Homo-oligomer: A and B are copies of this chain.
C-alpha cells in the first residue's frame, strides 16, 4: 500500500527465487521500467508478490551466517551470470532502491546490512505457510529464500512440517537438482540446511 524503496530489493529477491535462482538483466530492466512507469505496486502485483508484523521469530545471526555462506562475499560490484551488476551477498538493489552499478565497493558490515533488507520477506512467507519452530527456522529461511514462495507451498517438505520433522530434514536433500542435473553447491547447501535443521 504505502510504497517504500526498501521493498524494491525485496520484490526482486522474491522474484529471483520464483525465477529459479537468478535474475537476468532483461527482467531487472523490464521491472525497473515498470516501477518507473506504473509504480512499485504494479510491479509487485503482476509477479504475485504480496508485500508484508509477523511476531514469530526473526532470522538469527546464525541463520544469516549460512545464508551469507552460500551467497558469497563480493567486496566489489561484479556482473553476475545473468548479467546484473551485483555486490556483497547477492545484493542488486540497495535499501534506497538504487541499483548496484559498475564501480561500487563495500565492506562485510555494509553487505550484511543490505542482505537483511534483501531477506526481509522470508519470515513473513515462513509464517503464512507454517507451528512456531522456535529458532531453528534459520534453516527454513535459508531454504525459502533460495527456493521461493511457490516452491515451498507445493513441497512434500511442507507436508511433513504441518508433523514429521524427520522427513522434512531428509527432504532438504532431494532439492539438489537443477535442469535435470545434480548441483554440488545445492547438496552442499542442502546438507548445511539439513544439518542446521538439527540443533
Main SS class of interface, A: helix
Chain B residues within 8 Å of A42, by CB: 30, 33-34
Assess whether A179 is in contact with B153, with CB atoms less than 8 Å apart: yes
Which range contains the number of A residues in contact with the other chain?
35 or more
Q: A40-80 toward B: CB 8 Å interface, digit per residue (1/0)?
A: 01110111100000000000000000000000000000000
Assess whether A158 is in contact with B129, with CB atoms less than 8 Å apart: no
Assess whether B150 is in contact with A177, with CB atoms less than 8 Å apart: no
Assess whether A153 is in contact with B20, with CB atoms less than 8 Å apart: yes
Assess whether A177 is in contact with B151, with CB atoms less than 8 Å apart: no
Assess whether B153 is in contact with A178, with CB atoms less than 8 Å apart: yes
Chain B residues within 8 Å of A153, by CB: 20, 178-180
